[PDB]
Amino acid sequence: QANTSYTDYNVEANPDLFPLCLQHLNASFPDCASGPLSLTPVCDRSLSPKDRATALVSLFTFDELVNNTGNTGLGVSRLGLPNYQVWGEALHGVGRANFVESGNFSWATSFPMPITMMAALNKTLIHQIGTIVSTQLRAFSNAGLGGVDVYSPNINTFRHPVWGRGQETPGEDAFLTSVYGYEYITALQGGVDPETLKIIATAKHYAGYDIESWNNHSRLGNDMQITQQELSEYYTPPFIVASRDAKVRSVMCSYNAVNGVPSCANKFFLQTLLRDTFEFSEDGYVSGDCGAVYNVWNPHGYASNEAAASADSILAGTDIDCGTSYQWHSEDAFEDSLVSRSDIERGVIRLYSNLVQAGYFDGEDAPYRDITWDDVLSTDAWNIAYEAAVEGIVLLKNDETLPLSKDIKSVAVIGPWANVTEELQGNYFGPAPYLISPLTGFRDSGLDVHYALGTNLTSHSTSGFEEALTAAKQADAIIFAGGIDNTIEAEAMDRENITWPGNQLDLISKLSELGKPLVVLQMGGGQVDSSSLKDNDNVNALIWGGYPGQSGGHALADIITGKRAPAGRLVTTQYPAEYAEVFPAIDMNLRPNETSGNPGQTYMWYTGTPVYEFGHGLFYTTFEESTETTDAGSFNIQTVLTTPHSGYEHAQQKTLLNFTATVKNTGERESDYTALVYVNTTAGPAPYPKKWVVGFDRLGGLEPGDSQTLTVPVTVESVARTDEQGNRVLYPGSYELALNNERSVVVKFELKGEEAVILSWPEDTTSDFV
């Protein structure tokens, strides 16, 4: 929109937002004791949030209203209503507060990226990180340095491995991503529809959004073709959980179109599904992504100008524009009879219904107003950022080599990821209190360190190889730190292949020839094809370290020395290189299609051979896994659905059965234990998935010789399939539950009786109406 020459947004994936949209605001609170609103209904705490917000908005002029329809809400000076910034961020830490240069409020805790947080398979960790982030956000708000809503979490799935924003997600699985959303959202908001909202969370990006730019296909003009079956079974479940179960107060509509219609103008998505099917809060608001309303016109061409784009997005259910479309074009829309004043008010009322419920109008003694800089210091000092990295690092390959023997006195630390700063933080980060590189972690370890760069991330020069081989020949062991970073994968920048960059694999190869223990760190969010390292017996160990955050280097060193033990697992598939060449990344069809050369997408459908599977991870000990009951027997679909469901809003939320096993540490070292529970079946119509996740857990601190019971509740809805119309359906037939990729424990069950619908999927009558 603010471009200075011709810009084709069908190819360019970065919008050009106006400075008003990008402006940070100095935050403050309305004065309900003595200000102009003090004797008016918005300041009457006996009324509902909706009645208070409706009363406030009735006091505005139209010009005043329109100035508060965008993220940069200019306020209403006449009424003592402050400016209010909707555009906050908290992907993995406070991200878009008004950080000062130094001293108080100059930093916030930088956790690992979500892709690393999820690899821990610890739902309690995601919840605790959300509670700290929520506290830190409220500290910035009380200092005047931010608002009380954030555009987090990202609960899209990492469906295709090239995606430049997969790093922001909990991986490729809808079950894990749903649970991540639930934990992070309920932590941010301070409970499940609580008395006072702590931070308003925003589930994004709804929906069908998982490509930035691949092969020139800009997100801003992408029109993704998705079957109702796959929309219902895969592209929407995280949002169903966020809306129905976590009770999220905001959803962000995506830049892209689906089946012809931009999300923010998509009456089927916002009204028929989110509000009428997914039980979205009656007071919930939809934010457009930043420029997405403008994109309804340019470049989608769904509306013929920006005033018509604004009207179509408001009438579909986009309440707040991240942008300047509503602020600068809603008056023209009104004067051209495209919208009523009441239509424009509806979204601002919803926003302020949530600010009322967060205590914005309730004065200095309301909940969470007493959080200070000292609460940022004391929550950071818990070192949960370090704990998260320790739990989410994944061991892909090991012989005897890790943890390093007491005989290893010196390490050569080599490669582009060894000496780093902000690379540790991925994207959507604020300033950190410190950043510990892998180099620094080893320097702090008390091993002798010999550092050589060796090669840059994307280089075809061997200039630095000799210095690196020299360091390696004189050390007892070699740590090579490489992979990808946000110079390769970012917002508006998908990868065009899924191989290691530059000549990193060539230097690793030469390092493997020296007769020394060789440990490789594969960093970054997306996976790279490590088949050459898998196959090389002289590459002794391989770790995926993701984006490990402010304490990353200490976590990596502590795992490598065995001060801590790994138990993370991959939450995406590491595909072979050819996967990214053989079919278009914009093909949204999950099921294999030999005709189109689609081999099937994600661990659920892929018919090829991963380098390392979804759910792969190794330990510093051995486990023996067994169950008392390998055959859980039969359950009648009609019986399970027709008994009472005390404690659940819906019958299908009940536990169908517990997956239960005995896990014994039969090895030499204490370790945590991570478990994924997969279901597979021939029930329902072909084609059939290989399997799908129905549960997960992390057990803590199994000492050598000790046993712990694993108990994973498998719900009725977790084993439902999806019919060709998008209905969620329980089908009669044979099922198996399996522990991990190797299926160490298998529990069989049968569903008897007739098919039953558990979710009725509404017909899309709006997207193609004439």
Ligand X SMILES: *[C@@H]1O[C@H](CO)[C@@H](O[C@@H]2O[C@H](CO)[C@@H](O[C@@H]3O[C@H](CO[C@H]4O[C@H](CO[C@H]5O[C@H](CO)[C@@H](O)[C@H](O)[C@@H]5O[C@H]5O[C@H](CO)[C@@H](O)[C@H](O)[C@@H]5O)[C@@H](O)[C@H](O[C@H]5O[C@H](CO)[C@@H](O)[C@H](O)[C@@H]5O[C@H]5O[C@H](CO)[C@@H](O)[C@H](O)[C@@H]5O)[C@@H]4O)[C@@H](O)[C@H](O[C@H]4O[C@H](CO)[C@@H](O)[C@H](O)[C@@H]4O)[C@@H]3O)[C@H](O)[C@H]2NC(C)=O)[C@H](O)[C@H]1NC(C)=O
Ligand Y SMILES: *[C@@H]1O[C@H](CO)[C@@H](O)[C@H](O)[C@H]1NC(C)=O
Ligand Z SMILES: *[C@@H]1O[C@H](CO)[C@@H](O[C@@H]2O[C@H](CO)[C@@H](O[C@@H]3O[C@H](CO[C@H]4O[C@H](CO[C@H]5O[C@H](CO)[C@@H](O)[C@H](O)[C@@H]5O[C@H]5O[C@H](CO)[C@@H](O)[C@H](O)[C@@H]5O)[C@@H](O)[C@H](O[C@H]5O[C@H](CO)[C@@H](O)[C@H](O)[C@@H]5O[C@H]5O[C@H](CO)[C@@H](O)[C@H](O)[C@@H]5O)[C@@H]4O)[C@@H](O)[C@H](O[C@H]4O[C@H](CO)[C@@H](O)[C@H](O)[C@@H]4O[C@H]4O[C@H](CO)[C@@H](O)[C@H](O)[C@@H]4O)[C@@H]3O)[C@H](O)[C@H]2NC(C)=O)[C@H](O)[C@H]1NC(C)=O
Ligand U SMILES: *[C@@H]1O[C@H](CO)[C@@H](O[C@@H]2O[C@H](CO)[C@@H](O)[C@H](O)[C@H]2NC(C)=O)[C@H](O)[C@H]1NC(C)=O
Quick one: DSSP state of residue 71?
S
Residues 638-697 that bind a copy of itself (CB under 8 A): 638, 641-652
Residue 18: CB partners within 8 Å, gap ≥ 6? 1, 2, 323, 324
How many CB atoms are closer than 10 A to CB 535?
A: 9
Q: Which stretch binds a copy of itself (CB under 8 A): 21-29, 58-66, 218-226, 672-680?
A: 58-66
β-strand 257-258 against 394-397: which pairing, if any?
unpaired
Give the nearest distance from C-beta 118 to ligand X in angstroms. Answer: 12
- The one catalytic residue in 173, 210, 289, 485 is 289
Amino acid at 174: A
Give the nearest distance from C-beta 670 to ligand Z in angstroms. Answer: 12
With CB under 5 to 8 Å by kind, the binding choice for 366 among ligand U, ligand X, a copy of itself, none is none
Strands across the sheet containing 671-681? 631-636, 746-752, 733-739, 671-681, 692-702
Strands across the sheet containing 285-288? 202-206, 250-253, 285-288
- Residue 387 makes contact with ligand Z by CB under 6 A: yes
Burial classification of residue 497, based on how many CB atoms lie within 10 Å of its CB (0-12 exposed, 13-18 middle, 19 or more buried): middle
- Residue 711 makes contact with ligand Y by CB under 6 A: yes
Write the binding mask 667 to 696 for ligand Z: x where contact by CB under 6 A, - elsewhere.
Answer: -----x------------------------
- Residue 231 makes contact with ligand X by CB under 6 A: no
Per CB under 6 A, the list member of 456, 636, 715, 766 interacting with ligand Y is: 456
Q: Measured between alpha carbons, how far is 720 from 734 in angstroms, rounded to an integer?
A: 13
Beta-bridge partners for 521: 481, 543
Q: Which two tokens stand for residue 620?
A: 């510093």
Q: Which stretch binds ligand U (CB under 6 A): 15-23, 439-447, 679-687, 750-758?
A: 679-687
Write the binding mask 336 to 375 for ligand X: x where contact by CB under 6 A, - elsewhere.
Answer: ----------------------------------------
Nearer to ligand Z, 674 or 680 (CB): 674
- Residue 19 makes contact with K ion by CB under 5 A: no
| CA distances to 228, 230, 692, 699, 748 from 670, in Å | 47, 42, 30, 12, 31
E-assigned strand segments in 547-670: 623-626, 631-636, 655-665
Task: Say whether 370 is catalytic.
Answer: no
Number of residues engaging ligand X in binding (CB under 6 A): 16
Give the nearest distance from C-beta 426 to ligand X in angstroms. Answer: 20
In 3D space, the residue among 703, 697, 669, 683 whose CA is nearest the CA of residue 751 turns out to be: 683
User: Which secondary-structure segment (H or E) carries 231?
Assistant: none
- Residue 335 makes contact with a copy of itself by CB under 8 A: yes
Per CB under 5 A, the list member of 84, 182, 269, 579 interacting with K ion is: 579
Beta-bridge partners for 321: 70
Q: Which two tokens stand for residue 361?
A: 């109008």
Nearer to a copy of itself, 382 or 648 (CB): 648
With CB under 5 to 8 Å by kind, the binding choice for 7 among ligand Y, ligand Z, K ion, none is ligand Y
Q: Which stretch binds ligand Z (CB under 6 A): 98-106, 382-390, 713-721, 733-741?
A: 382-390
Give the nearest distance from C-beta 715 to ligand U in angstroms. Answer: 19
Q: Which two tokens stand for residue 494?
A: 């998908």
Give the nearest distance from C-beta 274 to ligand Y in angstroms. Answer: 26
Write the binding mask 590 to 609 for K ion: x where contact by CB under 5 A, - elsewhere.
Answer: ---------x--------x-
Residue 430: CB partners within 8 Å, gap ≥ 6? 93, 94, 95, 96, 97, 99, 107, 108, 110
Give the nearest distance from C-beta 683 to a copy of itself in angstroms. Answer: 14
- Residue 186 makes contact with a copy of itself by CB under 8 A: no
- Residue 710 makes contact with ligand Y by CB under 6 A: no
Residue 551: CB partners within 8 Å, gap ≥ 6? 383, 385, 386, 389, 436
Number of residues engaging ligand Y in binding (CB under 6 A): 44
Interaction site with a copy of itself (CB under 8 A):
40, 54, 58-63, 271, 276, 282, 315, 334-335, 337-343, 638, 641-652, 727, 729, 754-760, 763, 765-766, 769
Interacting residues with ligand U (CB under 6 A): 680-682, 734-736, 743
Active site residues per annotation: 289
